[PDB]
Design a protein around this motif. Sequence first.
Motif, PDB file in Angstrom:
ATOM      1  N   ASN A 199       0.810  -1.224   0.000  1.00 25.56           N
ATOM      2  CA  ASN A 199       0.000   0.000   0.000  1.00 25.56           C
ATOM      3  C   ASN A 199       0.842   1.273   0.000  1.00 25.56           C
ATOM      4  OD1 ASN A 199      -2.202  -1.908   0.470  1.00 25.56           O
ATOM      5  ND2 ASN A 199      -1.592  -1.816   2.620  1.00 25.56           N
ATOM      6  N   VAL A 200       2.048   1.212  -0.548  1.00 18.88           N
ATOM      7  CA  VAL A 200       2.966   2.342  -0.575  1.00 18.88           C
ATOM      8  C   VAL A 200       3.326   2.612  -2.031  1.00 18.88           C
ATOM      9  CG1 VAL A 200       5.311   3.081  -0.069  1.00 18.88           C
ATOM     10  CG2 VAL A 200       3.900   2.132   1.738  1.00 18.88           C
ATOM     11  N   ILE A 216      -4.423  -2.180 -14.719  1.00 19.00           N
ATOM     12  CA  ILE A 216      -4.422  -2.841 -13.414  1.00 19.00           C
ATOM     13  C   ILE A 216      -4.403  -4.345 -13.651  1.00 19.00           C
ATOM     14  CG2 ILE A 216      -5.835  -3.399 -11.399  1.00 19.00           C
ATOM     15  CD1 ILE A 216      -6.692  -0.584 -11.178  1.00 19.00           C
ATOM     16  N   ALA A 217      -3.444  -5.044 -13.045  1.00 20.88           N
ATOM     17  CA  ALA A 217      -3.322  -6.485 -13.211  1.00 20.88           C
ATOM     18  C   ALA A 217      -3.141  -7.146 -11.852  1.00 20.88           C
ATOM     19  CB  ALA A 217      -2.155  -6.845 -14.133  1.00 20.88           C
ATOM     20  N   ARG A 218      -3.391  -8.454 -11.803  1.00 23.24           N
ATOM     21  CA  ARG A 218      -3.316  -9.223 -10.565  1.00 23.24           C
ATOM     22  C   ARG A 218      -2.635 -10.554 -10.835  1.00 23.24           C
ATOM     23  NH1 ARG A 218      -7.920 -12.510  -9.709  1.00 23.24           N
ATOM     24  NH2 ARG A 218      -9.097 -10.593 -10.131  1.00 23.24           N
ATOM     25  N   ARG A 244      -0.426  -4.453  -3.523  1.00 23.70           N
ATOM     26  CA  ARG A 244      -1.427  -4.774  -2.513  1.00 23.70           C
ATOM     27  C   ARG A 244      -1.686  -6.271  -2.545  1.00 23.70           C
ATOM     28  NH1 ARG A 244      -6.604  -6.021  -2.419  1.00 23.70           N
ATOM     29  NH2 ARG A 244      -6.733  -5.770  -4.685  1.00 23.70           N
TER      30      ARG A 244
END
Lengths: 102, 46
Positions: free
Chosen positions: A20-21, A100-102, A57
């Motif tokens: 989360n940084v 955005i990827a996961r 994240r």
Amino acid sequence: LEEKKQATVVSRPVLLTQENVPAIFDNNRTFYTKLIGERNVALEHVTYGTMIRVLPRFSADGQIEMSLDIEDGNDKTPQSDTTTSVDALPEVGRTLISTIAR
Amino acid sequence: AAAGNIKIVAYPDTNSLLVKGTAEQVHFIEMLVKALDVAKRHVELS
């Protein structure tokens, strides 16, 4: 004439951060020009290079979702024999990706 | 109480919401959040 050609380039930036940084890696190049005015005299500049901005994240299963902002640019060169190689014309070609990827 | 005295503040350092209200309004927002929090699917466009 009878010409063959081949060229490979493999580049790799590495960056370390926490959960989360937001983090930034940047590897750029600045080109300064002299705009000879009289009042609002300024050093104007362009900038191009590799750049990552990521926001990692952890999900609930152990996968890592990221919010990416990738830029990879370099300097395209016109013909060197003509006069436009001595003035402030660095034709810049960039490549931008935002997803955005996961 | 009312619906106008609930305060919701984003805390991005641990990726979580902060809700301040009564014991019945906090449970009311917690049931809404679990309906908006679903996993997504990937699309590749060519």
